[PDB]
Amino acid sequence: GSSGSSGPDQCKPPQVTCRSATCAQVNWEVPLSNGTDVTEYRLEWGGVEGSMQICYCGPGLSYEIKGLSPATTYYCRVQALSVVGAGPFSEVVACVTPPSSGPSSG
């Protein structure tokens, strides 16, 4: 702090891919971190931005979400945890699932 910066750089927002009315895949990556390396990744996903919690935790980079609802807005935020301290979160990526009006294939 007083002398010498610590912690990785901001984390970029993941990529959401509405797999289905009740399905959504996410994907993130590691920022330009040379000094300290990332230990794990805490991804949060909840109905609305106001409501969000830890959904998946691990060194993984790709995660698929299921059991969602159609025509419903959702948000996700990924943060990088280091050995010196947890870094900031990424730009909340908003996404809305497609309406399930009728049958479905799968």
β-bridge partners, 62: 27
DSSP 3-state assignment of 55? strand
Separation of alpha carbons 6 and 77, rounded Å: 22
Separation of alpha carbons 104 and 20, rounded Å: 9
DSSP 3-state assignment of 82? coil
For 97, counting Cβ atoms within 10 Å of its Cβ (0-12 exposed, 13-18 middle, 19+ buried), the class is buried
Q: Which of 74, 84, 78 is nearest to 56 (CA)?
A: 78
- The answer to whether residues 21 and 102 touch, using CB atoms and an 8 Å cutoff, is no
Can you give the CATH number for the domain in which 72 is found? Answer: 2.60.40.10
Number of domains observed in the structure of the chain? 1
Separation of alpha carbons 90 and 76, rounded Å: 9
Range of the domain at 100: 1-106
Separation of alpha carbons 7 and 69, rounded Å: 37
Q: Which of 83, 64, 87 is nearest to 14 (CA)?
A: 64
Separation of alpha carbons 78 and 90, rounded Å: 6
Separation of alpha carbons 47 and 75, rounded Å: 7
CA 16 from chain centre, in angstroms, equals 9
